[PDB]
Design a protein around this ligand. Structure first.
Ligand SMILES: Nc1ncnc2c1ncn2[C@@H]1O[C@H](COP(=O)(O)OP(=O)(O)OP(=O)(O)O)[C@@H](O)[C@H]1O
Lengths: 606, 192
DNA sequence: CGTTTTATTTTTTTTTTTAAA
């Protein structure tokens, strides 16, 4: 019973209880509770192997394992948590010697991850010094601001060059520093000392549980000295932390103080390869069903013109560059972009929403709701002295992500013409009176293009329909059609399938097996240690067939190709080689181009 | 004093720069020979020097840089006095080089006092805007000569006393004219 | 056992916005 006067907490209890818990530890998930799971030693001892042998410091660790153990530890950790957490670090810093006594025991650890929240909208006096974790989407990308910890002194006679660190804010003054004979008066200087880093960026909560017609309400907090630009800013992320408060300087004439207290959260943590299962990796490549099988997975319920799931073939087994290590010239980036054209309310958002609901780099857009110039970080008025900064653009924070765009022929001429270069150049020359540079960003594009009309007018080859010329309307490889089959035949099918999606009350695990995650990992392996080349085999095809590509150009109101889409073809070459097991070029791949292209390119009848 | 470590690094400093440096001869006297016009004070010395003869005691130099740089400036003066017809009017400017070593991301509290190498561009700049950095004064009474260092940002016109216990808020206005001060400029620069 | 406290206005350039036969 040795305790702060105003509390009920003690070091030894929690220390011993947790050291027994980690001795009551074999991975209690994978060796006590999930015995059907298995990695059989206390994982933290295992880590003191797989940390020390890894030599890879600053562990990360939760504490939700502790529900089985005595919950009083849970509580007094919940409520008094800046005064027990170092004790659990001390237990770890003791565990060092369980597995290596005579190590280089000079480094420390970093570190929760267990408790709940619902939302930020409304909290209470009770919820003042307690553990919380909440999530949303990030807004900003800050700079650093350090923070002091100690005073380094000076002297006048005989070098009374004293020193001393800070509790948090005071140094004392008798007539000299650490009163040493007072040959002179007190001394201080403030630089040769200890400093500490941080930042500040805020979050926008973005769940599906956002109350009705309500605005953004948003939160923010600093960092600590290792938690500092962990962060490609702006995405769906959770934090843990400890609700903090602070009084405020009333007015500013003098030391008066406010009644109201501002709040933020303490600064801790954030939230986001296997040799074991090699078998199926090769198993799926050598299976010719890649054309459709995973494509069959993507739309979970929808066949909606499943030649578009073969258009989803276009898209993943990840996308190789022909970067230019030999000559160094020209920066030939292997970019990819296609659209999903309109004139019928088809799934030209729903797929884009399926994607954004899945990929974290998640944004949805369209004409007339926002500006073309949302790469600005506007200085309408700032918390500065008009040191006008355009901190970070918005539409470009999708680093190899996606922004979904809808209703594309919606905006003015300046909009959507301004982007005639970034597509295959990823440069944004900031040549304004303010600060200047040539920046970099490149990513993926998809939208729901629309002509001047609702329905494609018949009798009338496609180059006439959209109001772009036969250079810009005929630009890409193919910008793909979306029609109604003119009959009831197709119509009733997905009705009959998915009329009862309410009423099915089940899902069928067919031979087109709904891969829970066995899909999601192979693609992550899909780019690592084989490297698609291009030798002498699969290139002469449209070397020669450029005859066939362009000699349809003799014609107005018909259309041939132009020499950026051949680039799009050599970029098509990259994907299929490794998977199906020749990382050197095979010839069939160009057929996929003809399988794609002349589906609406030699549909040039007149 | 601890920093006598760096004074011995400053002994170290002298030890090779006055002695045989390179080429069978001197490296750092034509600088010295040229500085005499305004007492120019600008001199460049290689950091590889702290490898050629200091034998990689750069880590006895490269940490306490703003701590001991003043002393290195003292060494510059102590060099000049040993052979130049001199009075201690000699000031400071030391402009190290030869550091096989190269960024904004590799920055912390921890990076104080080093000699890393960085390159940028020219934008958003400001002009000459000098600073009468040194100067003289005293308290209400009598002691009107102070050749001290009033240059640290914590500087103030009124002082307490020199010879007798005087006032503590009073001030004289004094020799800002037969003395030595500086000049400087200021800009903004962006990542390479 | 005494002798002292405290205020700023108009114009720029960007990004927003808005007008006539
Ligand atoms: N075969 C199909 N399977 C599933 N859904 C379909 C199919 N055909 C049409 N739909 C539905 O039709 C809707 C089309 O409208 P959506 O809101 O995407 O329109 P849009 O593409 O923005 O329209 P537009 O591009 O013409 O403005 C989708 O929500 C989708 O659910």
């Amino acid at each position: 019973q040795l305790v702060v006067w105003g509390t009920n907490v003690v070091v030894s209890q929690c220390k011993s209880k947790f050291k027994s818990f980690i001795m009551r530890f074999i991975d209690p998930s994978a060796e006590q509770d999930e015995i059907s799971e298995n990695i059989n030693q206390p994982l933290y001892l295992q880590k003191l192997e797989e940390i020390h042998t890894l030599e890879e410091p600053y562990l990360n660790l939760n504490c939700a394992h502790l529900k089985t153990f005595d919950q009083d530890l849970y509580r007094q950790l919940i409520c008094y948590p800046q005064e027990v957490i170092p004790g659990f670090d001390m237990a770890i810093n003791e565990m060092f010697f369980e597995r290596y006594p005579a190590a280089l025991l000079e480094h420390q650890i970093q570190v929760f991850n267990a408790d709940k929240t619902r939302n930020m909208r409304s909290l209470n006096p009770e919820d003042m010094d307690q553990l919380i974790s909440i999530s949303g989407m990030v807004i900003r990308s800050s700079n650093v601001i350090p923070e002091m910890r100690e005073a380094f002194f000076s002297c006048n006679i005989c070098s009374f060059s004293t020193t001393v660190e800070v509790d948090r804010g005071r140094i004392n003054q008798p007539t000299l520093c650490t009163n040493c004979n007072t040959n002179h008066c007190f001394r201080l200087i403030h630089n040769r000392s200890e400093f500490t880093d941080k930042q500040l960026v805020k979050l926008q909560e973005s769940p599906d549980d956002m109350a009705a017609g309500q605005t953004p309400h948003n939160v923010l907090l600093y960092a600590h000295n290792d938690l500092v630009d962990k962060v490609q800013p702006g995405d769906r992320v959770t934090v843990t932390g400890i609700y903090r408060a602070t009084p405020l300087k009333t007015g500013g004439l003098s030391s008066s103080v406010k009644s109201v207290y501002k709040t933020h959260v303490d600064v801790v943590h954030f939230r986001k390869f296997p040799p074991e299962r090699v078998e199926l990796l090769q198993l799926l490549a050598k299976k010719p069903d890649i054309y459709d099988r995973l494509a069959r997975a993507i739309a979970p319920s929808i066949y909606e013109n499943d030649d578009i799931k073969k258009g989803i073939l276009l898209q993943l087994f990840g996308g190789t560059k022909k970067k230019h290590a030999t000559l160094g010239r020209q920066n030939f980036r292997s970019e990819i972009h296609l659209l999903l054209c309109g004139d019928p309310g088809t799934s030209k958002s729903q797929m884009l929403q399926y994607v954004f609901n899945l990929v974290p780099r998640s944004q949805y857009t369209s004409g007339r709701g926002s500006s073309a110039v949302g790469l600005t970080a506007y200085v309408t008025k700032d918390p500065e002295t008009r040191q006008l900064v355009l901190q970070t653009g918005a539409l470009v924070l999708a680093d190899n992500g996606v922004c979904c765009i809808d209703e594309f022929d919606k905006m003015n001429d300046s909009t959507r013409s301004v982007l005639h270069e970034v597509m295959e150049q990823q440069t944004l020359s900031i040549a304004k009176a303010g600060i200047i540079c040539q920046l970099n960003a490149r990513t993926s594009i998809l939208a729901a293009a629309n002509p001047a009309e609702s329905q494609w007018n018949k009798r009338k080859n496609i180059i006439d329909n959209v109001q772009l010329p036969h250079t810009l309307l005929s630009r890409f490889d193919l910008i793909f059609l979306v029609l109604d089959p003119q009959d009831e035949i197709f119509d009733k099918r997905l009705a009959s399938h998915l009329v009862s999606l309410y009423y099915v009350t089940r899902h069928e695990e067919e031979d087109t097996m709904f891969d829970m995650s066995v899909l999601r990992d192979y693609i992550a392996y899909a780019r690592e240690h084989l490297s698609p080349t291009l030798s002498d085999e699969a290139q002469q095809r449209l070397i020669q067939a450029y005859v066939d590509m362009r000699k349809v150009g003799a014609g107005r109101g018909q259309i041939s190709a132009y020499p950026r889409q051949l680039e799009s073809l050599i970029r098509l070459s990259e994907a299929h080689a490794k998977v199906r097991l020749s990382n050197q070029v095979e010839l069939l791949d160009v057929e996929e181009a003809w399988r794609l292209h002349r589906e609406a390119l030699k549909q040039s009848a007149t | 004093v601890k920093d006598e470590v760096g004074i011995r690094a400053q002994k170290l400093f002298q030890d090779f720069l006055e002695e045989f440096k390179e080429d069978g001869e001197i490296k750092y006297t034509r600088p010295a020979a040229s500085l005499e016009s305004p007492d120019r004070c600008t001199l460049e010395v290689s950091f590889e020097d702290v490898e050629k003869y200091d034998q990689n005691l750069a880590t006895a130099i490269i940490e306490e840089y703003y701590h001991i740089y003043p002393f290195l400036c003292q060494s510059v003066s102590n060099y000049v006095k040993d052979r130049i017809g001199l009075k201690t009017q000699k000031d400071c400017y030391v402009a190290f080089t030869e550091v096989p070593t190269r960024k904004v991301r590799d920055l912390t509290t921890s990076k104080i006092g080093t000699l890393i190498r960085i390159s940028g561009q020219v934008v958003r700049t400001h002009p000459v805007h000098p600073e009468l950095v040194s100067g003289v004064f005293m308290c209400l009474d009598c002691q009107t000569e102070i050749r001290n260092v009033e240059q640290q940002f914590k500087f103030t016109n009124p002082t307490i006393c020199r010879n007798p216990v005087c006032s503590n808020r009073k001030r004289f206005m004094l020799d800002v004219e037969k003395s030595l001060f500086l000049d400087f400029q200021k800009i903004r620069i962006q990542e390479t």
